[PDB]
mmCIF file of N, CA and C and ligand atoms in Angstrom:
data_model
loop_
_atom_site.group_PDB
_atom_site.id
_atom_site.type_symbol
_atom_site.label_atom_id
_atom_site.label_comp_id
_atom_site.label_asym_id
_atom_site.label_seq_id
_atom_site.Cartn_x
_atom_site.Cartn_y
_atom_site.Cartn_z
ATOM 1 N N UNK U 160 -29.214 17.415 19.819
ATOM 2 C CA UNK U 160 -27.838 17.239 20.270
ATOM 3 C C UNK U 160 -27.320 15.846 19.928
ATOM 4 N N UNK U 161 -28.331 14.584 20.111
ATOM 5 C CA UNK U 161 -27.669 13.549 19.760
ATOM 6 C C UNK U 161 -27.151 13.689 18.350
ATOM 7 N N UNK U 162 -28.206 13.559 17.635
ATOM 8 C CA UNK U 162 -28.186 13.721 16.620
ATOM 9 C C UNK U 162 -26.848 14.273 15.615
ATOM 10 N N UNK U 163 -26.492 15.593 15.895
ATOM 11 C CA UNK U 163 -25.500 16.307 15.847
ATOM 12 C C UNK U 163 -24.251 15.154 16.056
ATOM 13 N N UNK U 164 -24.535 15.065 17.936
ATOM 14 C CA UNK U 164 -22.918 14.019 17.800
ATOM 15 C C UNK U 164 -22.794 12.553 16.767
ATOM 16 N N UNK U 165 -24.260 12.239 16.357
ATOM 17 C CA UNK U 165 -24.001 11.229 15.460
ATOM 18 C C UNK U 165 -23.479 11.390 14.394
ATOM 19 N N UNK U 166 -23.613 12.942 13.670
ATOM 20 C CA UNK U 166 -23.411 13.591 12.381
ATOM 21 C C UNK U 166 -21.851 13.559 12.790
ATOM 22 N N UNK U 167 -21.144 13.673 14.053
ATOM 23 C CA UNK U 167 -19.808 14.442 14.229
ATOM 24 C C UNK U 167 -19.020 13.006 14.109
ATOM 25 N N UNK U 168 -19.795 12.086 14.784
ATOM 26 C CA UNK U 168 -18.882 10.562 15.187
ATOM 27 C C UNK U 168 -18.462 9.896 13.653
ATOM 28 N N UNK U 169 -19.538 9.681 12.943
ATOM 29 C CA UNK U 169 -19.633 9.322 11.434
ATOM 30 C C UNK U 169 -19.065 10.372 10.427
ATOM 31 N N UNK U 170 -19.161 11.397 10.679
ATOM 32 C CA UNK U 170 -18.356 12.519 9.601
ATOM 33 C C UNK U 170 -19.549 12.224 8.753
ATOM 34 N N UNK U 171 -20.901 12.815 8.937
ATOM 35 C CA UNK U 171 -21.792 12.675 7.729
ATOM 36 C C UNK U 171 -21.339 13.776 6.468
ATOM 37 N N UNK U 172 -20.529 13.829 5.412
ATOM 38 C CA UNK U 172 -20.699 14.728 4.656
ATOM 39 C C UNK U 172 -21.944 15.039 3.786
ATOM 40 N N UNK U 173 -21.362 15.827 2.889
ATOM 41 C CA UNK U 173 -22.540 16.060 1.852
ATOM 42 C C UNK U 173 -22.769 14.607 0.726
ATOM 43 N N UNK U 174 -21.790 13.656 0.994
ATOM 44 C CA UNK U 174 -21.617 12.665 -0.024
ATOM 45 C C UNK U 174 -21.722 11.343 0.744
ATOM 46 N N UNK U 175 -22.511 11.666 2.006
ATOM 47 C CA UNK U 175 -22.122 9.867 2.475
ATOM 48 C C UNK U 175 -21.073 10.293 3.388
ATOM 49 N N UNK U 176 -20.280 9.051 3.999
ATOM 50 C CA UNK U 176 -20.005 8.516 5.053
ATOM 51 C C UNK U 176 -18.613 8.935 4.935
ATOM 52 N N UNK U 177 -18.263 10.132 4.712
ATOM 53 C CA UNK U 177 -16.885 10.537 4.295
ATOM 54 C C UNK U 177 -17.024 10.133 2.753
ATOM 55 N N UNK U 178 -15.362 9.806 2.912
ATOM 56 C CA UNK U 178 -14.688 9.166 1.373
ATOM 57 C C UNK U 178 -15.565 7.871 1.668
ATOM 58 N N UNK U 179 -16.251 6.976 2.652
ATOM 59 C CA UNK U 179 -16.657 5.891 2.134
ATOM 60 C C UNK U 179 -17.725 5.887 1.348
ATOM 61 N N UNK U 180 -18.411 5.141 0.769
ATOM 62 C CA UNK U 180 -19.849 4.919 0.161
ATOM 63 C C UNK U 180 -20.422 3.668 0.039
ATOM 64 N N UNK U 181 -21.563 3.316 -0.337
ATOM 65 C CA UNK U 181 -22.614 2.422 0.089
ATOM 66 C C UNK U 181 -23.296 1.814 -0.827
ATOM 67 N N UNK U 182 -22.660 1.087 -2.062
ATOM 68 C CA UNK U 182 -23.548 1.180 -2.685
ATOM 69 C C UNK U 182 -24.541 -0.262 -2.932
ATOM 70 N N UNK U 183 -24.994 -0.495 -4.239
ATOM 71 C CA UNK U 183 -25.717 -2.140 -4.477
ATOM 72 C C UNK U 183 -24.809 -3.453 -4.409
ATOM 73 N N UNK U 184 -23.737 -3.111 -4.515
ATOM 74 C CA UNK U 184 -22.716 -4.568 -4.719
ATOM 75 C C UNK U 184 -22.166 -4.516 -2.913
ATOM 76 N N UNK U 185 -21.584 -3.304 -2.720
ATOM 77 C CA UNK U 185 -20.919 -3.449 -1.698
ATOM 78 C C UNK U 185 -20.028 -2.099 -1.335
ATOM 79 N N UNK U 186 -19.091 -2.253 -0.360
ATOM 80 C CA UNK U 186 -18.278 -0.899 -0.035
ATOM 81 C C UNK U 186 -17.706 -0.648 -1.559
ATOM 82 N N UNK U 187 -17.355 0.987 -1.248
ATOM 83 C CA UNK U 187 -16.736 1.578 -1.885
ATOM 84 C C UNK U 187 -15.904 2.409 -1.258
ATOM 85 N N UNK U 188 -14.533 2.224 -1.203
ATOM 86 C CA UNK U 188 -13.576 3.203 -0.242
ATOM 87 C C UNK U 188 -12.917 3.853 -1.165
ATOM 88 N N UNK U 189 -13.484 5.183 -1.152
ATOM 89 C CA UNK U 189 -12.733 6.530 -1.711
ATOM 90 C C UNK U 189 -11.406 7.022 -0.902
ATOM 91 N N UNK U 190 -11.086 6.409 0.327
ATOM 92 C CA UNK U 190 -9.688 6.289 1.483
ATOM 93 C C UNK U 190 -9.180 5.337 1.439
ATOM 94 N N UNK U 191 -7.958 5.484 1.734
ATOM 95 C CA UNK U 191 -7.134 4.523 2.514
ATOM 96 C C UNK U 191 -7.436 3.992 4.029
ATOM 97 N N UNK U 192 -7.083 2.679 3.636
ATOM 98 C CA UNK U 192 -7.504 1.638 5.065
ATOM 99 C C UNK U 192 -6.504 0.855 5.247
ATOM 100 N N UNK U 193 -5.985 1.460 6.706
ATOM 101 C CA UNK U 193 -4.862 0.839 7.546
ATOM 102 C C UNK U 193 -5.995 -0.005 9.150
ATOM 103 N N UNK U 194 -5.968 -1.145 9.359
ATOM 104 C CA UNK U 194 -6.966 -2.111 9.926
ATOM 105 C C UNK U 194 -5.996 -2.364 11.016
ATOM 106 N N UNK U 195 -6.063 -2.047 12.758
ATOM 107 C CA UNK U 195 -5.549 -2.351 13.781
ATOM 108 C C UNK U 195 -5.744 -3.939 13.761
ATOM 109 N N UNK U 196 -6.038 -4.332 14.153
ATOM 110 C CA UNK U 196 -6.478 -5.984 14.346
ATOM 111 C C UNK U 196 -6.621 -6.617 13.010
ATOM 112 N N UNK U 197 -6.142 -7.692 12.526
ATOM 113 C CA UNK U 197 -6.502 -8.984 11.721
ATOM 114 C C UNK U 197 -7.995 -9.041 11.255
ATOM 115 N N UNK U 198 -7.508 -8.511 9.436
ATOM 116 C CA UNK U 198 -8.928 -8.796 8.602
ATOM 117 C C UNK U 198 -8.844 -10.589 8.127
ATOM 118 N N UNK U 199 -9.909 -10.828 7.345
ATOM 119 C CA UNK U 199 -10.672 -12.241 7.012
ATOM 120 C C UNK U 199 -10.715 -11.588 5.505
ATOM 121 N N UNK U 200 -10.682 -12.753 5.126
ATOM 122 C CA UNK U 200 -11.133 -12.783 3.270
ATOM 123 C C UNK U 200 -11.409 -14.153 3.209
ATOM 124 N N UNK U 201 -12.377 -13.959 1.574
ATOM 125 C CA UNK U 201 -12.355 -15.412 1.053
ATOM 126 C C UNK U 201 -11.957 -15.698 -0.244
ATOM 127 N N UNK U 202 -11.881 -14.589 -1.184
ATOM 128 C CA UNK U 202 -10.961 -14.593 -2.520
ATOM 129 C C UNK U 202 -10.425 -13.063 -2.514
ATOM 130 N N UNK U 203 -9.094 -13.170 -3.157
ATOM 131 C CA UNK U 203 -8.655 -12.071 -3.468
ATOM 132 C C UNK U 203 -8.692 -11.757 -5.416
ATOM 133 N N UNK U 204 -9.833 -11.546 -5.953
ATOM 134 C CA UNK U 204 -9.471 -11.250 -7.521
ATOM 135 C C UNK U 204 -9.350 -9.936 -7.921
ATOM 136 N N UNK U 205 -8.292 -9.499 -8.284
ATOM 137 C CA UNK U 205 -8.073 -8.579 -8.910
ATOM 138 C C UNK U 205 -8.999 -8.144 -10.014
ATOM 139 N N UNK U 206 -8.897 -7.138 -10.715
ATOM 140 C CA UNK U 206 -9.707 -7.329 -12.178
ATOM 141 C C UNK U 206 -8.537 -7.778 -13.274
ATOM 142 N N UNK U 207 -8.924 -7.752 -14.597
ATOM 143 C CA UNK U 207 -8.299 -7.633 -15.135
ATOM 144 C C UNK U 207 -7.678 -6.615 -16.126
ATOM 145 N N UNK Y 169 60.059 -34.770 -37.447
ATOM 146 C CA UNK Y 169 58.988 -34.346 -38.043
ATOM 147 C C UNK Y 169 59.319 -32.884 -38.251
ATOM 148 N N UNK Y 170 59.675 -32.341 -39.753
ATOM 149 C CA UNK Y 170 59.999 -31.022 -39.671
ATOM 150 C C UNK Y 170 59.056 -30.669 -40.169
ATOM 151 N N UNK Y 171 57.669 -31.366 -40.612
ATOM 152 C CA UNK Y 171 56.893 -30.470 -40.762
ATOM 153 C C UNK Y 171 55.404 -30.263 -39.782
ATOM 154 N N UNK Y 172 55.736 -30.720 -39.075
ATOM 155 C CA UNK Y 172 54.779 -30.382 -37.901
ATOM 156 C C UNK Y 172 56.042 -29.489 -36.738
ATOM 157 N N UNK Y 173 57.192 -29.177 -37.203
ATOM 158 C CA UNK Y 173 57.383 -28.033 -36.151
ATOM 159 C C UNK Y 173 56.051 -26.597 -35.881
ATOM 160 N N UNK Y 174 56.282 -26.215 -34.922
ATOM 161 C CA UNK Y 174 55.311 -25.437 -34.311
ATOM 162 C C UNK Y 174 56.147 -24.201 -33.650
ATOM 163 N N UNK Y 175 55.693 -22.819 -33.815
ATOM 164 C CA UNK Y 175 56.752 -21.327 -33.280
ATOM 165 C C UNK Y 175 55.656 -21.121 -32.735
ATOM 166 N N UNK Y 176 55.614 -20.689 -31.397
ATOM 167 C CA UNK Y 176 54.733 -19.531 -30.930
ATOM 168 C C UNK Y 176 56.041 -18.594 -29.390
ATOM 169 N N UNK Y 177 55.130 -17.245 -30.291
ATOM 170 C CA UNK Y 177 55.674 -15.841 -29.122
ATOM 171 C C UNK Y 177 54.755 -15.584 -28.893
ATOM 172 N N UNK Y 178 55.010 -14.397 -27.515
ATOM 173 C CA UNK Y 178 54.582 -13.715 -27.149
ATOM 174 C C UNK Y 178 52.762 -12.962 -27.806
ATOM 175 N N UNK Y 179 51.911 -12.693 -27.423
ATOM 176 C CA UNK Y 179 50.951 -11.779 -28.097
ATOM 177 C C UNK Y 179 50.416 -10.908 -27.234
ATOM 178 N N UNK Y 180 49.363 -10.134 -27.629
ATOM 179 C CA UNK Y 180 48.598 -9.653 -27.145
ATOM 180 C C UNK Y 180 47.080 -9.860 -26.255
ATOM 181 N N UNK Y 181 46.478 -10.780 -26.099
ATOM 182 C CA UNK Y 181 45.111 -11.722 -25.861
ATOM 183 C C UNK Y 181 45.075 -11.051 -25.116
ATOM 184 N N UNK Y 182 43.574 -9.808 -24.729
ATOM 185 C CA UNK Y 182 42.832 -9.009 -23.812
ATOM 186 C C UNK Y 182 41.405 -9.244 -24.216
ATOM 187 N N UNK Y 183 40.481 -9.835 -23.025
ATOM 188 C CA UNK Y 183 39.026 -9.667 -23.604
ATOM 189 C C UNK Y 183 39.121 -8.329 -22.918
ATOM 190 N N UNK Y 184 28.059 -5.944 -9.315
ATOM 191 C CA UNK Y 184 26.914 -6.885 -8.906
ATOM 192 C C UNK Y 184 26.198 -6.088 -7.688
ATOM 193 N N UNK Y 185 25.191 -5.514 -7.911
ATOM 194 C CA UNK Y 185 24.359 -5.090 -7.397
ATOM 195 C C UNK Y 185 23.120 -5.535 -6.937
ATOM 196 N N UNK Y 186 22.380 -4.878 -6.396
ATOM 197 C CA UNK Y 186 20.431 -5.354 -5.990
ATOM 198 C C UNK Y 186 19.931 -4.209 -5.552
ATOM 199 N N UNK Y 187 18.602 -3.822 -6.182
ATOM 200 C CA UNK Y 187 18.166 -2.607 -5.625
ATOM 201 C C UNK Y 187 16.897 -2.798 -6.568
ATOM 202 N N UNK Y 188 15.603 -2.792 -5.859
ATOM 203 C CA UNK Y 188 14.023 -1.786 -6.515
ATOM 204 C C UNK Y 188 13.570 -1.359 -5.497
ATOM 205 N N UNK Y 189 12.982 -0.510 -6.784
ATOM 206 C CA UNK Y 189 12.237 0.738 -5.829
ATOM 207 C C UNK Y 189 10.576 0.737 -6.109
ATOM 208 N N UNK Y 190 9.976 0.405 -5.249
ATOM 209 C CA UNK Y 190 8.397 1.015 -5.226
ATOM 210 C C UNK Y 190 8.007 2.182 -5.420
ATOM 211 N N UNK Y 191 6.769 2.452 -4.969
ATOM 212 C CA UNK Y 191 6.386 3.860 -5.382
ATOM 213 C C UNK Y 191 5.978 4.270 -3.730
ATOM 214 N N UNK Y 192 5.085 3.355 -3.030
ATOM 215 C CA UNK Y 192 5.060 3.800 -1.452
ATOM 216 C C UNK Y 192 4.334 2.640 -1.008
ATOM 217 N N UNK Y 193 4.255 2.787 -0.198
ATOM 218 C CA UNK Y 193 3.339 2.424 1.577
ATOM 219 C C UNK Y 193 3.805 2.827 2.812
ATOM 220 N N UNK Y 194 3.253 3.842 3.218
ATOM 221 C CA UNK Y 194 3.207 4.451 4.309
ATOM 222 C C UNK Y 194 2.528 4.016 5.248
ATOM 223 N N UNK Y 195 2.569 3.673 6.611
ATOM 224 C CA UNK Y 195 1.550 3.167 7.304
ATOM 225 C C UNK Y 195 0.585 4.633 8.396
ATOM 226 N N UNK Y 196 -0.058 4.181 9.447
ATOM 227 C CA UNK Y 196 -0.674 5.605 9.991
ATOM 228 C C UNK Y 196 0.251 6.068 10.846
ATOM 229 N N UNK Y 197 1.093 7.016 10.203
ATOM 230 C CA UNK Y 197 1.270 8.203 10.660
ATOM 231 C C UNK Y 197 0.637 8.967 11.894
ATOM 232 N N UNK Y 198 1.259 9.399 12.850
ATOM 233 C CA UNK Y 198 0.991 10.504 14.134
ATOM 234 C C UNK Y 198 -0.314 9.645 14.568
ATOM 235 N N UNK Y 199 0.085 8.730 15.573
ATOM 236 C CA UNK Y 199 -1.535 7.830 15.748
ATOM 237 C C UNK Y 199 -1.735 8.305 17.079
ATOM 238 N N UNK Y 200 -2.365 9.041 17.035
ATOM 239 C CA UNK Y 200 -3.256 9.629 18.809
ATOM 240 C C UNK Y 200 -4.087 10.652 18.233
ATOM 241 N N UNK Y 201 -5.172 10.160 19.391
ATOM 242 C CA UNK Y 201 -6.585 11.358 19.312
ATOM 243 C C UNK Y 201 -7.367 10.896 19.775
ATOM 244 N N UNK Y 202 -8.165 11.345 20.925
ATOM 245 C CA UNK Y 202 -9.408 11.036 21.585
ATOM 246 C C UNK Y 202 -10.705 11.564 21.431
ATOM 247 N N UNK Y 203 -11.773 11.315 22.115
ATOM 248 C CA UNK Y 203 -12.939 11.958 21.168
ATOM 249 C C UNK Y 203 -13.791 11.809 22.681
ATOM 250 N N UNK Y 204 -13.444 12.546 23.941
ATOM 251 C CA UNK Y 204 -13.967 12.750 25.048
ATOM 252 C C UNK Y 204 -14.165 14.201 25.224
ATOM 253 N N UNK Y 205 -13.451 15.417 24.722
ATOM 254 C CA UNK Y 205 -13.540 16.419 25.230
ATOM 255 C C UNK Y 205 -14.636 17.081 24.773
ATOM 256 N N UNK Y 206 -14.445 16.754 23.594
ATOM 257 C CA UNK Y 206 -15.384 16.995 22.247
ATOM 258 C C UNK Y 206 -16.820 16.468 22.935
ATOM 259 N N UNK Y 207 -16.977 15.360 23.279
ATOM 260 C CA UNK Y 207 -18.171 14.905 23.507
ATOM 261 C C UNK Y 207 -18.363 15.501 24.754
ATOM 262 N N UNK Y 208 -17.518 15.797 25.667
ATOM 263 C CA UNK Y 208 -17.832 16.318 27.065
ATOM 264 C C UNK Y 208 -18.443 17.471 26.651
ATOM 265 N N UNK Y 209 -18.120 18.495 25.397
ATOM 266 C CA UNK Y 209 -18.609 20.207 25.349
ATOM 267 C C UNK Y 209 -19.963 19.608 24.876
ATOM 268 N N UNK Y 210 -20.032 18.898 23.830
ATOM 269 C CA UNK Y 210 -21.458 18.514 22.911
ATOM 270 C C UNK Y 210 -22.721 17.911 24.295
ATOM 271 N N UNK Y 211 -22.068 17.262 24.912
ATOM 272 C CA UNK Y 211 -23.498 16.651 26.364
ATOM 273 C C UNK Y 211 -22.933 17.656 27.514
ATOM 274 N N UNK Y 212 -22.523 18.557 27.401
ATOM 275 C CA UNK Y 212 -22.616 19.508 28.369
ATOM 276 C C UNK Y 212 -23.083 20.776 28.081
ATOM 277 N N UNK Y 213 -23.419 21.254 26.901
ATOM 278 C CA UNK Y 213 -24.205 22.396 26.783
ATOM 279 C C UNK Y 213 -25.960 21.737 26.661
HETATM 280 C C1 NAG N 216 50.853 -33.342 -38.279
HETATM 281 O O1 NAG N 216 50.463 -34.607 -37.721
HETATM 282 C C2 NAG N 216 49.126 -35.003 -38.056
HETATM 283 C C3 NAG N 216 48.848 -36.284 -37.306
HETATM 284 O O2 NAG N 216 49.735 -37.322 -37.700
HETATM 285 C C4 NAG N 216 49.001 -35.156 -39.568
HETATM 286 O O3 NAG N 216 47.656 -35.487 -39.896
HETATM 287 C C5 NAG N 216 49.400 -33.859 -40.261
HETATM 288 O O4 NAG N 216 49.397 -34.042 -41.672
HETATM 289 C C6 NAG N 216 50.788 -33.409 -39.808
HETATM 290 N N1 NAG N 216 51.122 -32.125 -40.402
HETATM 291 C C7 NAG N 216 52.049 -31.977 -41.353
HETATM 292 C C8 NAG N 216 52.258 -30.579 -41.854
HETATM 293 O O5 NAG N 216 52.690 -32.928 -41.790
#
């Protein structure tokens, strides 16, 4: 049963963590992210 | 000076906006939903 609600709280799909993912560098957001409270950064670089 | 007289008539002599548009940003939409009832059926069976 826990278990289960952990699968339900996280949305475990068949691919990971929803649209998010996990990989060697860092996040990968396959969604859109709207952030209640004030994010932090330390560079913003685009690519080119 | 009759030869710097000078004739002139009559002639003819005839020779703001702001606006862009993006594409979107929408922010979250329909924001409510709780996650008690759900958990009340899941630790109550
Ligand atoms: C009109 O006056 C100017 C200035 O003195 C002179 O250079 C010019 O030759 C004069 N025009 C004629 C047609 O005399």
């Amino acid at each position: 049963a826990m278990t289960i609600w952990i699968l339900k709280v996280m949305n475990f799909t068949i691919d990971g963590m929803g649209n998010l993912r996990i990989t060697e560098k860092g996040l990968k957001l396959e969604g859109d992210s709207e952030f209640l409270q004030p994010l932090y950064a330390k560079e913003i670089q685009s690519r080119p | 000076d009759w030869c710097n007289v000078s004739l002139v008539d009559t002639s003819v002599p005839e020779p703001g906006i702001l606006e862009h548009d993006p594409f979107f940003c929408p922010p979250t939409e329909a924001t409510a939903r709780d996650f008690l009832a759900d958990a009340l059926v899941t630790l109550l069976v």
